[PDB]
Paper text:
RBM45 is an RNA-binding protein with roles in neural development by regulating RNA splicing. Its dysfunction and aggregation are associated with neurodegenerative diseases such as amyotrophic lateral sclerosis (ALS) and frontotemporal lobar dementia (FTLD). RBM45 consists of three RNA-recognition motif (RRM) domains, two at the N-terminus (RRM1 and RRM2) and one at the C-terminus (RRM3), and a pseudo-RRM domain in the middle. In this work, we identified that the C-terminal RRM domain of human RBM45 (RBM45RRM3) sequence specifically binds GACG sequence RNA and solved the crystal structures of RBM45RRM3 in apo form and in complex with a single-stranded DNA that mimicked the recognized RNA.
To determine the structure of the C-terminal RRM (RRM3) of RBM45, we tried a series of different RBM45 fragments containing RRM3 for crystallization, and finally obtained crystals of a fragment from residue 370 to the C-terminus (hereafter named RBM45RRM3) and resolved its crystal structure at 2.4-Å resolution. There are four RBM45RRM3 molecules per asymmetry unit, containing residues from Gln370 to Arg466 or Glu467. The last nine residues at the C-terminus, including the NLS, are disordered in all four molecules. RBM45RRM3 bears the canonical RRM fold, which is characterized by a βαββαβ topology. The four β-strands form an antiparallel β–sheet in the order of β4–β1–β3–β2, while the two α-helices are located on the same side of the sheet. The exposed side of the β-sheet is predominantly positively charged, indicating a potential RNA binding surface. The overall structure of RBM45RRM3 can be well aligned with the AlphaFold-predicted model with a Cα root-mean-square deviation (RMSD) of 0.42 Å (for 86 residues). The major differences occur in the N-terminal loop, C-terminal loop, and some other loop regions, and these regions also show diversity among the four molecules in the asymmetric unit. The β2–β3 loop of RRM3 is much shorter than those of RRM1 and RRM2, whereas the α2–β4 loop of RRM3 is a little shorter than that of RRM1 and significantly longer than that of RRM2. The most significant difference is that RRM3 has a distinctive N-terminal loop surrounding α1 and touching α2 as well as the α2–β4 loop.
Residue numbers in the entry: 369 to 466
Write the structure that this text describes.
Amino acid sequence: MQIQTDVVLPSCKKKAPAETPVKERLFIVFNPHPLPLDVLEDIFCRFGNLIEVYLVSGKNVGYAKYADRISANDAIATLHGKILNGVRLKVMLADSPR
């Protein structure tokens, strides 16, 4: 599993239980192609309270469900605009994209 990034990351945290009701949602937009799912889970669990991350099939869009608003905001502040494994990322609130 590759981790090549230009940002300092927190350690991996445990995911919230899969059935946890969703509190915050993020769009992840990949330029030029999406990243593998295991990489995405490793990266996005690091902010805590990650319920799930998945890709929209065959598209450059992923979706991050968090059990905590502050955690998702941390993921935005840390990852938006950064490069991961050769891919540029946009991370934004799903309900109000920038």
